[PDB]
């Protein structure tokens, strides 16, 4: 029993982290096979970030201008190219620790683990979600760009995020591993403001199922609802509209607990309208939305990775 | 910016996890040098757990009765001994992935990372604290015993916890790596109830400093207090008494923010008496007590491990 915000084991990703320095800027890179991936703003000074022309700035950079260090050893850069907002630095040595991996572009509402790194060295691991406004609420200081987000299915690491930017409001923006930003954000130090931080309804419901499986049952009420009636309440509280696709995804948790999805929706509706009255659910005083239905099943079934 | 519940990178510990089977019971072991450490209740059936005589049960076990598997390969058990509540299984091969390590017995209030494992395979990593009642609030299913808790300082893993038991109330109990339980708990399936779940005051204060460093400043008030006056409020709310030792430990965070420790205490006192009025601090609707002052400094300074 017990339900915790749980990250994936990070060892497979630790073995891929390197330090990348270009001129005076140092950040992290991801070394997979004979390629190191990093944010293209490694080529920028802080002055450059205000209005960078990346193609022009890149002209002044050769292979030998990218210093790549894995622990205490250099890697030799034999080619480089810009793909969207990432650089691909070809090195002469394939990473002997390369795991099985894929690059995936995730949907808003999906979760992943972040290995926060500085100077190519892992500092910590935590769980994030891609918010509906395409930001993430991470923990990133200077030096952390190029840290990655990932999921693991057995022995395959699916990389889905690379950190690039901190917005003036303290939330975070980045790209997939093909270098395309999530949402409308750009790698320029400008006025970029995030849209509404909407709550991920299907994730709240999954977490309520996790609470029931763990004995936290006080919020179960005598009511049910419909999708359209629930969504009238979802909209007022800045919750994502619940769809039939979401109902289908919650099917297994509904079967395990014997609580119909729409009955759980009516419980959530009462929590939104009445608050929690100073009570807690799984040790939280607010409605948690960064566990997916898949996250709940994994943590409740003990799925492992090798 | 951003502050997250952050675990240590788990790769150094992943390489030490093995599966231990004795008879029909399978759990996890920790392989360091040529010794595998695991809970002694690996020798018990579920019936045995009601009133086990471990010395008697162990008589019926020989080296060859302990099946130890690292991934897909057996390890050969060449000796075994009981130390308190752990078994030490001597194997004929030193773990080639053994990190620099120490065994430490932690104090209540200190935090650590848990690598939850099943059948010797890591499933996830999360952050815990040793509660003042000597329980931990973890996430452990059947199969998870022998999972360990640890801290890392640079390249040295300090192992501090091994999971043994789930209490009927759903909280968790275990030992240090010398096999001595934290608190009064025993490895027997009996009525063991936890004492008061007291809040770790020095950790709440550290987290309030983390909030200020991140721009969450609404709870700063115009008041100060004294240790004795604060502790009159701490006692009413089941908070640990704050001591001068705690004040000294918070010194660096006080210096960085310019907020005197006793001024932060008066802010906390108002939060305890008035509640948070539906507001949040670092995304939490309650007062968080599982970050130590050291955890805050590390996460706020970007300390790394290699």
Class by alpha and beta content of chain A: alpha+beta
Count of individual beta strands of chain A? 13
Tally of helical segments of chain A: 8
Major beta sheet summary of chain A = 7 strands, antiparallel
What pair of chains forms the biggest interface? A-B, 57 and 57 residues
Helicity level of chain A:
10-25%
Estimated radius of gyration of chain A: 21 Å
CATH third-level topology of the domain at 201-300 in chain A: main proteinase (3clpro) structure, domain 3
> CATH superfamily of the domain at 201-300 in chain A, please?
main proteinase (3clpro) structure, domain 3
Oligomeric composition of the shown chains: homodimer
What is the CATH class name of the domain at 201-300 in chain A?
Mainly Alpha
Q: Please give the alpha-carbon distance between the first and last residues of chain A.
A: 23 Å
Cytoplasmic side (chains A, B): 1-306
Cross-link (Glycyl lysine isopeptide (Lys-Gly) (interchain with G-Cter in ubiquitin)) (chains A, B): 5, 90
Domain Peptidase C30 (chains A, B): 1-306
Subcellular location (chains A, B): Host cytoplasm; Host Golgi apparatus; Host nucleus
Summary tags:
homodimer, 306 residues, alpha+beta, main proteinase (3clpro) structure, domain 3, seven-stranded antiparallel sheet, six-stranded mixed sheet
Describe the structure.
2 copies of one chain form a homodimer. With 306 residues, chain A is an alpha+beta fold. The first copy, chain A, contains 8 helices and 13 strands. In chain A, strand 12 (156-166) and strand 13 (172-175) form a beta hairpin. Chain A starts with 10 loop residues before the first helix and ends in a 5-residue tail after the last helix. The interface between A and B is large, with 57 and 57 residues. The PDB classes it as viral protein.
């Amino acid at each position: 029993s017990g339900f915790r915000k749980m990250a994936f084991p990070s060892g497979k990703v630790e073995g891929c982290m390197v330090q990348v320095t270009c001129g005076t800027t140092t950040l992290n890179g991801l070394w997979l096979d004979d390629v190191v991936y990093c944010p293209r703003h490694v080529i920028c000074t802080s002055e450059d970030m205000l209005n960078p022309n990346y193609e022009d700035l890149l002209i002044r950079k050769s292979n030998h201008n990218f210093l790549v260090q894995a622990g205490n050893v250099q890697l030799r850069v034999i080619g480089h190219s810009m793909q969207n907002c990432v650089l691909k630095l070809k090195v002469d040595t394939a990473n002997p620790k390369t795991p099985k991996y894929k690059f995936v572009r995730i949907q808003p509402g999906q979760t992943f683990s972040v290995l926060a790194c500085y100077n190519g060295s892992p500092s910590g691991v935590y769980q994030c979600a891609m918010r509906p406004n395409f930001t993430i609420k991470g923990s990133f200081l200077n030096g952390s760009c190029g840290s990655v987000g990932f999921n693991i299915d057995y022995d395959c690491v699916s990389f889905c995020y690379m950190h690039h930017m901190e917005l003036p409001t303290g939330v975070h923006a980045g790209t997939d591993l093909e270098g395309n930003f999530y949402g409308p954000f750009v790698d320029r130090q400008t006025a970029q403001a995030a849209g509404t931080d909407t709550t991920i309804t299907v994730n709240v419901l999954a977490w309520l199922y996790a609470a029931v499986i763990n004995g936290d049952r006080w919020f179960l009420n005598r009511f049910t609802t419909t999708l359209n009636d629930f969504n009238l309440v979802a909209m007022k509280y800045n919750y994502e509209p619940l769809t039939q696709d979401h109902v289908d995804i919650l099917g297994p948790l509904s079967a395990q607990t014997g609580i119909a999805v729409l009955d759980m929706c009516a419980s959530l509706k009462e929590l939104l309208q009445n608050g929690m009255n100073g009570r807690t659910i799984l040790g939280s005083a607010l409605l948690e939305d960064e566990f997916t239905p898949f996250d709940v099943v994994r943590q409740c079934s003990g799925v492992t990775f090798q």
